[PDB]
Amino acid sequence: KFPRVKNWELGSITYDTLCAQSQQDGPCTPRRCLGSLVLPRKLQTRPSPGPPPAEQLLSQARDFINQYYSSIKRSGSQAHEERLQEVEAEVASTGTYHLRESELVFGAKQAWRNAPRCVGRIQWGKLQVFDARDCSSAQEMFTYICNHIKYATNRGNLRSAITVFPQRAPGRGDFRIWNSQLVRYAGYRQQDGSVRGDPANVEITELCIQHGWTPGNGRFDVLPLLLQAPDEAPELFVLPPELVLEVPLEHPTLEWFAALGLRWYALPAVSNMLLEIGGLEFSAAPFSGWYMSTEIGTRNLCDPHRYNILEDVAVCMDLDTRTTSSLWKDKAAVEINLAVLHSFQLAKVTIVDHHAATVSFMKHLDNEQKARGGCPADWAWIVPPISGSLTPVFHQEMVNYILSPAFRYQPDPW
Amino acid sequence: GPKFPRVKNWELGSITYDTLCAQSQQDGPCTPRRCLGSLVLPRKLQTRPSPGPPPAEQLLSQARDFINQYYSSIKRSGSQAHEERLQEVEAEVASTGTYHLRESELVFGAKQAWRNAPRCVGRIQWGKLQVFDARDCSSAQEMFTYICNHIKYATNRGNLRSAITVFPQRAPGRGDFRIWNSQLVRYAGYRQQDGSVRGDPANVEITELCIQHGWTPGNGRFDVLPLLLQAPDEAPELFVLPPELVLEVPLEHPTLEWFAALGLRWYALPAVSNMLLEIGGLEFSAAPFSGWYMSTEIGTRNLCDPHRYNILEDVAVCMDLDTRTTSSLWKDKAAVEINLAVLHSFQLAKVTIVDHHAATVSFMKHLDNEQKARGGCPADWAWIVPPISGSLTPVFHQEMVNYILSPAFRYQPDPW
Numbered sequence: 001k002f003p004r005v006k007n008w009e010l011g012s013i014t015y016d017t018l019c020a021q022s023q024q025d026g027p028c029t030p031r032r033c034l035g036s037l038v039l040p041r042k043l044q045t046r047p048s049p050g051p052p053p054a055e056q057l058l059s060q061a062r063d064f065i066n067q068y069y070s071s072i073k074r075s076g077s078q079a080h081e082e083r084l085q086e087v088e089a090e091v092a093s094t095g096t097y098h099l100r101e102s103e104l105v106f107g108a109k110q111a112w113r114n115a116p117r118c119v120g121r122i123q124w125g126k127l128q129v130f131d132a133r134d135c136s137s138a139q140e141m142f143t144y145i146c147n148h149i150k151y152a153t154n155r156g157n158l159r160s161a162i163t164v165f166p167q168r169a170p171g172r173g174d175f176r177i178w179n180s181q182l183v184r185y186a187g188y189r190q191q192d193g194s195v196r197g198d199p200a201n202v203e204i205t206e207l208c209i210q211h212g213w214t215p216g217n218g219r220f221d222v223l224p225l226l227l228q229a230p231d232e233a234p235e236l237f238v239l240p241p242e243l244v245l246e247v248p249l250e251h252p253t254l255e256w257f258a259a260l261g262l263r264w265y266a267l268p269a270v271s272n273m274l275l276e277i278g279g280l281e282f283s284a285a286p287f288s289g290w291y292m293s294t295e296i297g298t299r300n301l302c303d304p305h306r307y308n309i310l311e312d313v314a315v316c317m318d319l320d321t322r323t324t325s326s327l328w329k330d331k332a333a334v335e336i337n338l339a340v341l342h343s344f345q346l347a348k349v350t351i352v353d354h355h356a357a358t359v360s361f362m363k364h365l366d367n368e369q370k371a372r373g374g375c376p377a378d379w380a381w382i383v384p385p386i387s388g389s390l391t392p393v394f395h396q397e398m399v400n401y402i403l404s405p406a407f408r409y410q411p412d413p414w
Numbered sequence: 415g416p417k418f419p420r421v422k423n424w425e426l427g428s429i430t431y432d433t434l435c436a437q438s439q440q441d442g443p444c445t446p447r448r449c450l451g452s453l454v455l456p457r458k459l460q461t462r463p464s465p466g467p468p469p470a471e472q473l474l475s476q477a478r479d480f481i482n483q484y485y486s487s488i489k490r491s492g493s494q495a496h497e498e499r500l501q502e503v504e505a506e507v508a509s510t511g512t513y514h515l516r517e518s519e520l521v522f523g524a525k526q527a528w529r530n531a532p533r534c535v536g537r538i539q540w541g542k543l544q545v546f547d548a549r550d551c552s553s554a555q556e557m558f559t560y561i562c563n564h565i566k567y568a569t570n571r572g573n574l575r576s577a578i579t580v581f582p583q584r585a586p587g588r589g590d591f592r593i594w595n596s597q598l599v600r601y602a603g604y605r606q607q608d609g610s611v612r613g614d615p616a617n618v619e620i621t622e623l624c625i626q627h628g629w630t631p632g633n634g635r636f637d638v639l640p641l642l643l644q645a646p647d648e649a650p651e652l653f654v655l656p657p658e659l660v661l662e663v664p665l666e667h668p669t670l671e672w673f674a675a676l677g678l679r680w681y682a683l684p685a686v687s688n689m690l691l692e693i694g695g696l697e698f699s700a701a702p703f704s705g706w707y708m709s710t711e712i713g714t715r716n717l718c719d720p721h722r723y724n725i726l727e728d729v730a731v732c733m734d735l736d737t738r739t740t741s742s743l744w745k746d747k748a749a750v751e752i753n754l755a756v757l758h759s760f761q762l763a764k765v766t767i768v769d770h771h772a773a774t775v776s777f778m779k780h781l782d783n784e785q786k787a788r789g790g791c792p793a794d795w796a797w798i799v800p801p802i803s804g805s806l807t808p809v810f811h812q813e814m815v816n817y818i819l820s821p822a823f824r825y826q827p828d829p830w
């Protein structure tokens with residue numbers, strides 16, 4: 001059936017009919033809901049040593065091709081019919097097929113548009129697509145990645161972009177970017193288990209060292225990239241410092257904040273997810289946009305398993321950390337988020353606060369309701385990590401399901 | 415690995431498997447196709463009025479399951495007493511179409527219902543519940559007496575005690591016992607000529623129902639509403655709670671001296687009165703239960719929700735913040751001070767309350783307890799994580815499995 005979706009702040013109601021177009025199962029069942037789980041048990045994306053079932057692939061390919069021609073208002077046209085025949089021909093003889101650049105561009109934008117966990121989707125139509133499918137080495141991957149970064153950064157005036165490397169091929173190894181993001185701060189394990197830097201990057205930091213990287217000893221050492229060409233050991237590449245724009249954090253009124261020596265990079269670029277389009281899989285397709293302040297100020301800096309700076313800022317603010325009821329944690333967190341926004345604005349680097357971002361998502365939901373009869377969204381990820389109910393999305397019911405094209409998680413290459 | 419949901423805590427990196435979900439006998443709203451976990455009222459549980467007596471076969475199954483749960487809880491499963499109790503229930507349903515619970519069974523079921531509530535973050539307290547048996551109540555007037563006694567016992571002058579009063583169960587083709595109000599304490603919501611609302615917008619409908627039934631309305635922002643109590647097959651009767659029994663707390667701020675001037679306040683006792691308590695197929699349409707507040711309920715939702723008192727702008731203006739731009743984080747700053755005021759005021763008045771940090775930490779302990787005791791704990795992530803400072807609390811980083819277990823507290827249609 002079609003779910004009734006209500007917004008409790010406004011009392012408005014809609015019905016999601018788009019979910020009926022989903023062809024991939026999620027983790028839930030009538031007996032129990034697993035919507036709060038981060039990763040799949042296996043929904044992932046298993047190996048590719050053998051060719052995907054011709055029937056299945058062809059079914060997905062046709063669907064995508066149909067989606068494409070519908071987007072250009074040329075459905076049923078001569079081109080549409082012949083393109084479909086081309087794909088069938090290629091699959092029947094080779095067990096796979098290839099996308100035309102225009103189809104790739106449309107597919108990438110749709111994958112972003114369909115990502116249920118992305119609150120910035122109102123920007124889905126504005127995405128610069130770099131075709132890197134004519135890449136045959138790790139060195140070439142590095143060149144493409146540097147160009148992506150320079151373009152995406154644009155001196156602080158961030159522009160959303162994605163670079164697409166060669167699709168996966170049967171029996172052959174994948175092109176892969178080992179790092180989870182193009183910019184990551186090192187996490188060094190020492191002495192008594194503690195960690196200097198970012199605890200989230202301990203494993204990747206160690207891998208780089210093992211592969212020849214001369215480690216530093218700071219809290220914010222930008223890591224090198226481990227790029228891997230098919231069936232070859234990954235190679236190490238150091239990003240030119242002038243390409244990695246960073247923002248020193250300072251507070252608008254608290255003079256001592258800057259003394260904390262905190263900072264964060266301007267460009268958020270995901271590099272470990274897989275882009276699936278019409279059955280084809282792109283194991284290396286880094287995409288980037290701009291940060292929403294809470295990602296840095298709340299999660300990256302305040303998570304207990306991350307930089308965990310909450311108590312330090314609290315002590316500097318001379319707050320009463322003796323008890324939970326003083327809400328010192330809440331107070332410290334707000335100022336940290338403020339410092340991030342202030343600093344990025346001062347540095348003239350694009351960023352959006354959680355209020356503005358959620359307000360735009362609500363508009364996006366409305367645009368999509370009229371455009372496709374619904375919009376897949378993951379409530380737990382859409383609602384900000386702080387001030388949840390202070391934002392409109394908290395009061396908005398959502399329907400979560402999987403549509404394709406899609407960005408999916410994939411196994412670590414090591 | 416194990417054929418059950420793998421649950422992970424991303425803060426500690428620890429893993430568990432939920433085997434308790436295998437015990438669920440009722441389906442939720444989700445399917446492999448789409449997750450509806452964020453819906454407030456998906457139409458499943460929803461105990462819609464089912465007048466004509468229920469299928470004896472249906473009731474019996476639920477009844478046997480509950481009796482098994484009961485005997486299992488006292489470690490006498492498979493015993494003579496167990497088999498005899500089962501026989502009695504089957505015989506009673508066989509001749510009357512329904513059955514009745516022993517005193518100790520009602521106490522066990524009520525506690526289990528709380529224990530099974532996926533949306534309650536205060537379940538670490540589940541074992542300590544005062545169960546008032548009111549299954550002898552036969553009039554709206556007597557319901558009021560029982561309710562007043564509940565309020566007095568539960569309030570205990572500020573040192574709140576969890577409690578539940580159970581009125582007669584639904585009977586074959588007979589009228590239900592019902593408390594029309596959603597809570598025992600509710601502030602009136604008066605629709606204004608210009609279309610706005612004075613008081614609590616959440617209670618507009620009930621406020622009007624009270625007026626329609628003879629209540630003389632006030633014009634304040636915090637007027638305690640009267641109760642509309644309904645005995646079987648009778649029109650609801652209006653009852654005014656004696657002021658001395660409704661403990662309220664004026665709100666003031668620890669450092670911001672002007673906050674007290676705002677004239678804000680909230681009642682001490684959170685008592686849910688419109689939910690249905692289901693035990694072994696038996697349905698208790700009127701069984702008000704109460705505990706104590708978690709500060710965010712008052713400070714964040716009730717006082718700052720756009721559709722509630724909506725005081726964010728007022729307080730922000732008082733703090734002299736830049737309310738003209740989102741990036742000043744004025745909403746966040748005001749909400750924090752409003753929450754601090756709630757905690758400070760309740761502490762000053764010596765009325766029980768728990769902040770969202772302490773409450774969530776205790777819930778984590780509860781999850782650990784339940785993992786060992788039952789192999790899991792059904793939890794609604796969206797309701798467990800607090801409305802403010804979500805990731806600053808431990809529950810945010812804890813994956814959760816949601817499912818329906820009985821005994822349980824379910825939503826039921828409004829009697830009007």
Ligand code: HEM
Nearest residue numbers: 112115117118119120123160161287288289290291292407
């Ligand atoms: C234009 C600015 C954008 C903003 C402000 C934005 C913001 C967000 C936020 C806050 C998250 C969660 C991040 C986290 O908690 O780690 C998210 C997730 C996501 N976004 Fe966006 N986004 C933007 C651009 C993009 C772009 C350009 C793409 C791809 C073309 C994209 C794809 C996704 C995906 C796939 C996820 C989920 C990742 C996961 O499952 O871990 N976003 N976005």
Ligand code: HEM
Nearest residue numbers: 528531533534535536539576577703704705706707708823
């Ligand atoms: C001892 C103190 C307790 C605390 C701090 C606590 C806290 C909470 C909170 C924060 C909520 C969410 C309320 C909302 O958002 O409107 C909740 C939900 C719930 N609690 Fe507890 N609780 C406690 C006692 C009780 C008791 C005594 C019972 C029953 C015997 C109970 C049954 C429930 C139920 C059924 C819900 C969900 C109601 C719904 O779906 O609307 N709680 N609790």
Ligand SMILES: C[C@H](O)[C@H](O)[C@H]1CNc2nc(N)[nH]c(=O)c2N1
Nearest residue numbers: 036037038380381810811812813
């Ligand atoms: C366990 C829980 O699913 C997990 O902590 C989720 C919650 N919501 C989130 N939301 C966003 N945007 N990003 C995250 O990493 C998470 N983590």
Ligand SMILES: C[C@H](O)[C@H](O)[C@H]1CNc2nc(N)[nH]c(=O)c2N1
Nearest residue numbers: 394395396397452453454796797
């Ligand atoms: C739409 C969404 O389900 C709704 O706003 C929920 C979210 N989480 C909640 N959590 C609690 N504790 N209480 C609520 O009323 C809600 N409302």
Ligand SMILES: CCS/C(N)=N\c1ccccc1
Nearest residue numbers: 268270287288289290291292
């Ligand atoms: C695509 C960068 S858009 C962004 N603001 N952040 C993300 C960080 C990690 C994963 C996904 C999104």
Ligand SMILES: CCS/C(N)=N\c1ccccc1
Nearest residue numbers: 684686703704705706707708
């Ligand atoms: C049983 C009061 S326990 C409590 N703090 N709040 C609730 C408010 C509304 C519904 C359920 C719980």
Ligand SMILES: [Zn+2]
Nearest residue numbers: 028033444449
């Ligand atoms: Zn679900």
